[PDB]
Amino acid sequence: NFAELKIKRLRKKFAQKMLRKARRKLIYEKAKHYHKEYRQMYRTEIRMARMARKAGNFYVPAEPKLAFVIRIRGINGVSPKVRKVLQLLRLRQIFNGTFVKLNKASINMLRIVEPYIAWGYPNLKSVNELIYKRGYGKINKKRIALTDNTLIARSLGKYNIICMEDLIHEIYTVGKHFKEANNFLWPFKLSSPRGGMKKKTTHFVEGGDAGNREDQINRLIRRMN
Amino acid sequence: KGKPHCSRNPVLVRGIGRYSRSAMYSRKALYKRKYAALATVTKPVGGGTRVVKLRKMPRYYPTEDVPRKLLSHGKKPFSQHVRKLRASITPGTILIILTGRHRGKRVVFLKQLSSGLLLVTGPLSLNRVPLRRTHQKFVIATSTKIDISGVKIPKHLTDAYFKKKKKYEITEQRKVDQKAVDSQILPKIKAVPQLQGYLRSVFALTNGVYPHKLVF
């Protein structure tokens, strides 16, 4: 028989194909909306600074909410407290990197381990490149390279993150589930900095590489990835 | 049925079209293009008729066999590879053969062949080289050119013509083709003063001159 079963097979196939097409359109429109939002955010600071200058006052921009941290010292001879903080920040290997959202706790935690890390405020392009090139997902306690959107969609579907654009937007804007997104994100393994470092041991202010560099972390990332 | 129209968008960049999805939906006029829903042969025999089965089963299977291969897409046979040519090489340019039996002989270049090899010849009347093929990598292209846009070379010569056979005897067809090409090439190079002697000479490196310094 199966005169109906055979057509039902392809009916199910067509339904699945239409569902996939709808999902693709959804993520495409969401990416377009994210691009619009990024442009709006970029122009808003310029507008506010311009109006403040025109009025003669000053416009202090909001303190950055997202930071990128790279471990720049080895495993040998580490104080136990610094070792514990590095373990908590998930920097167990030299030239590992991760994103950290900022608050009092994060500030003090980073201050404890200033000599061992170089951290700064990542740029949108830096986030994009880091996610696309070095970004691997932690699925089933396994380091899986993110080569398809379904891998992201399963691990973060309940948080309405369904593709690379959602992941990047949520990381860059520090969304409501930034903790879940960042934890799903495996720590980045960056190559050695092409062109060399200035001086690993000392602080960035005194001509070294350790400590906080506000936006030079983007210059560092460009050569470390 | 239906004559195959050309693509409606010029290639902006490789893999990216000039017009978007909606512009294409308009240009294709798809708003009015909606659509909706062997192995046996009978033969006579002198008995009766026999249903002979072509594609019969093999009479020997090997002890063991290798499995199939996984499928790959970007790999194409050498026949349909895209052919590249250096910018400095144009018809009528002087080349310096670097690796053949004709080491360092200045030779006039005529045409790019189908498999990528250069069809080259300096009239063997003066520098002693016939119609020949040469890989574009193994030649130095100097910046001296003659005008051969107004010469005709036979269409019958090709890679199948120049393919090696099997003592090698030159054929009368080879001789007549060489004469036909050189009878037009030679007057062009004789117009330029001191060019025949230049082609007769042989390139070489003496002490104190270095290729990265000297220009050609």
Binding site: F14, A15, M18, L19, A22, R23, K25, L26 | K34, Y35, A36, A37
Partner: peptide, 19 residues
């Protein structure tokens, strides 16, 4: 529409409309 459950009828609608 992209929701597998509530978007089934809308998906059917657009699929039939394409015809």
């Amino acid at each position: 529409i992209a929701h597998p459950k509530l978007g089934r009828r809308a998906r059917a609608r657009i699929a039939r409309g394409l015809r």
